[PDB]
Structures are given as C-alpha cells and as structure tokens.
Scaffold this active site. Sequence first.
Site, PDB file in Angstrom:
ATOM      1  N   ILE A  32     -14.607   4.153   7.145  1.00  0.00           N
ATOM      2  CA  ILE A  32     -14.349   5.565   7.474  1.00  0.00           C
ATOM      3  C   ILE A  32     -14.000   6.418   6.249  1.00  0.00           C
ATOM      4  O   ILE A  32     -13.899   7.642   6.355  1.00  0.00           O
ATOM      5  CB  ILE A  32     -13.257   5.729   8.559  1.00  0.00           C
ATOM      6  CG1 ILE A  32     -11.889   5.236   8.073  1.00  0.00           C
ATOM      7  CG2 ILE A  32     -13.669   4.999   9.827  1.00  0.00           C
ATOM      8  CD1 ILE A  32     -10.787   5.448   9.087  1.00  0.00           C
ATOM      9  N   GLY A  33     -13.810   5.778   5.097  1.00  0.00           N
ATOM     10  CA  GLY A  33     -13.528   6.490   3.856  1.00  0.00           C
ATOM     11  C   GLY A  33     -13.912   5.661   2.644  1.00  0.00           C
ATOM     12  O   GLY A  33     -13.877   4.437   2.699  1.00  0.00           O
ATOM     13  N   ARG A  34     -14.296   6.330   1.562  1.00  0.00           N
ATOM     14  CA  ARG A  34     -14.652   5.655   0.312  1.00  0.00           C
ATOM     15  C   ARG A  34     -13.911   6.256  -0.868  1.00  0.00           C
ATOM     16  O   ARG A  34     -14.040   7.450  -1.156  1.00  0.00           O
ATOM     17  CB  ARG A  34     -16.152   5.761   0.047  1.00  0.00           C
ATOM     18  CG  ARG A  34     -17.013   5.127   1.122  1.00  0.00           C
ATOM     19  CD  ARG A  34     -18.475   5.085   0.707  1.00  0.00           C
ATOM     20  NE  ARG A  34     -19.211   4.088   1.478  1.00  0.00           N
ATOM     21  CZ  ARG A  34     -19.182   2.774   1.255  1.00  0.00           C
ATOM     22  NH1 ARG A  34     -18.448   2.258   0.267  1.00  0.00           N
ATOM     23  NH2 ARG A  34     -19.892   1.963   2.032  1.00  0.00           N
ATOM     24  N   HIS A  36     -12.703   5.237  -5.156  1.00  0.00           N
ATOM     25  CA  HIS A  36     -13.008   4.433  -6.344  1.00  0.00           C
ATOM     26  C   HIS A  36     -12.280   3.108  -6.333  1.00  0.00           C
ATOM     27  O   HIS A  36     -12.846   2.083  -6.722  1.00  0.00           O
ATOM     28  CB  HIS A  36     -12.637   5.219  -7.605  1.00  0.00           C
ATOM     29  CG  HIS A  36     -13.058   4.553  -8.896  1.00  0.00           C
ATOM     30  ND1 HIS A  36     -14.345   4.494  -9.296  1.00  0.00           N
ATOM     31  CD2 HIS A  36     -12.305   3.937  -9.894  1.00  0.00           C
ATOM     32  CE1 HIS A  36     -14.416   3.855 -10.483  1.00  0.00           C
ATOM     33  NE2 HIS A  36     -13.166   3.513 -10.846  1.00  0.00           N
ATOM     34  N   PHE A  37     -11.017   3.124  -5.904  1.00  0.00           N
ATOM     35  CA  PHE A  37     -10.189   1.913  -5.846  1.00  0.00           C
ATOM     36  C   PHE A  37     -10.408   1.088  -4.582  1.00  0.00           C
ATOM     37  O   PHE A  37      -9.953  -0.049  -4.527  1.00  0.00           O
ATOM     38  CB  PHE A  37      -8.694   2.243  -5.964  1.00  0.00           C
ATOM     39  CG  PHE A  37      -8.332   3.050  -7.185  1.00  0.00           C
ATOM     40  CD1 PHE A  37      -8.904   2.784  -8.424  1.00  0.00           C
ATOM     41  CD2 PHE A  37      -7.392   4.070  -7.097  1.00  0.00           C
ATOM     42  CE1 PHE A  37      -8.561   3.527  -9.540  1.00  0.00           C
ATOM     43  CE2 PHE A  37      -7.043   4.817  -8.210  1.00  0.00           C
ATOM     44  CZ  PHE A  37      -7.630   4.545  -9.434  1.00  0.00           C
ATOM     45  N   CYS A  39     -12.275   0.888  -0.119  1.00  0.00           N
ATOM     46  CA  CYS A  39     -12.770   1.444   1.137  1.00  0.00           C
ATOM     47  C   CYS A  39     -11.645   1.592   2.166  1.00  0.00           C
ATOM     48  O   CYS A  39     -10.585   0.991   2.040  1.00  0.00           O
ATOM     49  CB  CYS A  39     -13.905   0.574   1.704  1.00  0.00           C
ATOM     50  SG  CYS A  39     -15.463   0.633   0.765  1.00  0.00           S
ATOM     51  N   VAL A  40     -11.897   2.413   3.179  1.00  0.00           N
ATOM     52  CA  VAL A  40     -10.947   2.647   4.263  1.00  0.00           C
ATOM     53  C   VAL A  40     -11.618   2.286   5.575  1.00  0.00           C
ATOM     54  O   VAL A  40     -12.807   2.574   5.766  1.00  0.00           O
ATOM     55  CB  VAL A  40     -10.500   4.129   4.321  1.00  0.00           C
ATOM     56  CG1 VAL A  40      -9.331   4.303   5.287  1.00  0.00           C
ATOM     57  CG2 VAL A  40     -10.142   4.635   2.932  1.00  0.00           C
ATOM     58  N   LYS A  53      -6.507   1.209   4.195  1.00  0.00           N
ATOM     59  CA  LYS A  53      -7.138   1.297   2.890  1.00  0.00           C
ATOM     60  C   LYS A  53      -7.026  -0.014   2.115  1.00  0.00           C
ATOM     61  O   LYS A  53      -5.925  -0.515   1.858  1.00  0.00           O
ATOM     62  CB  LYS A  53      -6.540   2.422   2.057  1.00  0.00           C
ATOM     63  CG  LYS A  53      -7.056   2.395   0.629  1.00  0.00           C
ATOM     64  CD  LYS A  53      -7.223   3.760   0.007  1.00  0.00           C
ATOM     65  CE  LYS A  53      -8.142   3.651  -1.200  1.00  0.00           C
ATOM     66  NZ  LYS A  53      -7.836   4.722  -2.166  1.00  0.00           N
ATOM     67  N   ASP A 147      -2.932  16.048  -8.342  1.00  0.00           N
ATOM     68  CA  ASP A 147      -4.325  16.179  -7.895  1.00  0.00           C
ATOM     69  C   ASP A 147      -4.471  16.953  -6.584  1.00  0.00           C
ATOM     70  O   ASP A 147      -5.254  16.573  -5.700  1.00  0.00           O
ATOM     71  CB  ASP A 147      -4.966  14.779  -7.775  1.00  0.00           C
ATOM     72  CG  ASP A 147      -6.484  14.824  -7.681  1.00  0.00           C
ATOM     73  OD1 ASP A 147      -7.110  15.890  -7.939  1.00  0.00           O
ATOM     74  OD2 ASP A 147      -7.072  13.787  -7.316  1.00  0.00           O
ATOM     75  N   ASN A 152      -8.332  16.714  -1.063  1.00  0.00           N
ATOM     76  CA  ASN A 152      -7.155  15.832  -1.020  1.00  0.00           C
ATOM     77  C   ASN A 152      -6.064  16.198   0.005  1.00  0.00           C
ATOM     78  O   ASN A 152      -4.913  15.764  -0.120  1.00  0.00           O
ATOM     79  CB  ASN A 152      -6.560  15.725  -2.420  1.00  0.00           C
ATOM     80  CG  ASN A 152      -7.452  14.919  -3.347  1.00  0.00           C
ATOM     81  OD1 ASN A 152      -8.184  14.034  -2.892  1.00  0.00           O
ATOM     82  ND2 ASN A 152      -7.425  15.237  -4.624  1.00  0.00           N
ATOM     83  N   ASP A 165      -3.565  11.932  -0.410  1.00  0.00           N
ATOM     84  CA  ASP A 165      -3.929  11.471  -1.748  1.00  0.00           C
ATOM     85  C   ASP A 165      -2.757  11.397  -2.725  1.00  0.00           C
ATOM     86  O   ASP A 165      -2.844  11.905  -3.826  1.00  0.00           O
ATOM     87  CB  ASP A 165      -5.005  12.389  -2.330  1.00  0.00           C
ATOM     88  CG  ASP A 165      -5.482  11.933  -3.686  1.00  0.00           C
ATOM     89  OD1 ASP A 165      -5.895  10.751  -3.795  1.00  0.00           O
ATOM     90  OD2 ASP A 165      -5.435  12.760  -4.627  1.00  0.00           O
TER      91      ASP A 165
END
Length: 288
Positions: A32-34, A36-37, A39-40, A53, A147, A152, A165
Amino acid sequence: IDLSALNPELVQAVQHVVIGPSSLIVHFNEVIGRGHFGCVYHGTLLKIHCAVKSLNRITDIGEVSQFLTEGIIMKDFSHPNVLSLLGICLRSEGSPLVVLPYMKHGDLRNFIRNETHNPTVKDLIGFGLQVAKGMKYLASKKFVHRDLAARNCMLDEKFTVKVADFGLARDMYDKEYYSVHNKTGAKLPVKWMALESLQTQKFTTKSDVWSFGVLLWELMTRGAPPYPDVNTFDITVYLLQGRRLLQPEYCPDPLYEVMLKCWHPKAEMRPSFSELVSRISAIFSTFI
Ligand SMILES: Cc1cc(-c2cc(F)c3nnc([C@@H](C)n4ccc5ncccc5c4=O)n3c2)on1
C-alpha cells in the site's frame, strides 16, 4: 531486546511500544506504500486496520537501543493532526516492522491532485490549518521535522490531516524531489528548504516554517510542483535574485501574505507555528 542497554528511565516505556507477533497480522500480498527504506502493507491489530512498514531495503537499522528510544519518544506524541505510532513488532527473520494507523485517503498531495475529489478553497485552507496545528504541537515538543511537504502529510477516513513522515516512519516516498548534495552526499528536498538550510544543511523549526509556506502554496495550486523551470541546487541562485513562488489564482491575499512571512530571509522573523494557526484560523473563518 536488551533492556539493560536502554536509558534506565525508559525501560518501563518499552512494554507500551512493543507489539507481540500474536497481536498483529501483516498482509504481505498487497503493497500500500513504497519508500526508499522499504514497503508498506495492510495489517490488522488487536480489529484495528493499520499500515505496517518494512525497513528491509536498508542494510541495517543501526543501534537497536536507539531505534527503541526513537520509538518510545514517538509513541508519547499524541495530537489529532500528527500521525501516531501504534508500535513496533519484532519479527525473527528481518528488521522490525513499524506499525502506523491506516490512512484511507493517502498523502495530501495526491489527494488534492485527485480528479475524483473536489475540495473548496475553504477546505484547502482548513487542510493547511490542520497541518499548522500538528506542527505547533511538534514544535512545542522541540521536534524539528526537516521534510514538511504535502507528500508527507496524510488523510484518514474522516479527512483529518496528519503531519506524517517523521521518527520511525521517516522515508523518501517520492524520490523525484530529493537531490544529492555534492560535498555531503545527503539527499535533500531542496525546493522545500529555507535559504539558510540550503547553505548550512542545518534545519530548525524556523526552516519547517519555510517548508510550511511551500506546503500552503501546494494546497492553493492543488498540488502543482514548485519551481518547475528551476533545476535542483540552482534554487539558491533563483531565490537570491529576489524571487518567491507566485500567488496562486484562488489563494486569498492575506494567505499569500502569510506565505511571504514564512519565506522571510531572516529565520528569526518568520512567524511561529502558534501565529500561523491564529492567522490561518481567521482567514479560514471568512469563507462559507
Ligand atoms: C506519495 C506517498 C506518500 C506516502 C507517505 C507519506 C507519509 F508522510 C508517510 N508517513 N508514513 C507513511 C507510511 C508509513 N504509510 C502510513 C500509512 C499508510 N496508510 C495507508 C496507505 C499507505 C500508508 C503509508 O504508506 N507515509 C507514506 O506514501 N506514498
């Protein structure tokens, strides 16, 4: 986990942050989310729908006692416009999983860009006021976001906006907007950054205030990219020519005046988040 390795005052708080594997089902079948560190995934907590996450795209999470300490700090934050930490679940094979509330309507930027949604100017200003309240809370905790941007922040099922975030949820969820510094290698959100941070790479609550001004601009343009015809670190040169983002068509004049105060050249002259909540709530109240 090694309780001895923690600050002795925090050991009691660990039981309230740690989620036992028995209490959490993760549905690894659907991302459901991507970031860099990592996936979700959807997850169910004991029936609470949550977002889980993974941090497995990183080679290592650093010091485990520090990770726990971050989790503990984050867990004590509670505000309706700040994304909460439900907990962290320790899995045998792999890094820990971070457990966040499920945010039905996703990130604020995509929400305002969505053709199927039709927020009024009042609604957009209210999204901004909600972000300002979340940031006033974080700033009162002496927490610097670093950020802040529309990408975010996230919206739950009642369209409540939450500053997201940060802490253990911190990632790059849209890599386009991060550029590598040449001397330090750090990947920075240059188009949201204050002039002084572009120079020093030091971030403060007053640099979050600058980012918030950009976020207001994103809202009133329903998610346009800021400074498209400027390239990465040429933004410093562009700003110092004596330039700012232009007033969006449907942005009220006093809201543009708030944006300009958020971008004050002297960090110390920018409004506090308390002041932004006050000024924005007034502008919001004039609309029907
Ligand atoms: C674009 C974009 C932005 C995000 C995003 C932004 C955040 F500020 C943020 N903070 N935490 C997350 C991750 C942990 N997350 C949290 C809840 C959630 N709920 C439903 C669907 C996805 C997520 C999610 O990715 N975020 C994802 O994901 N894709």
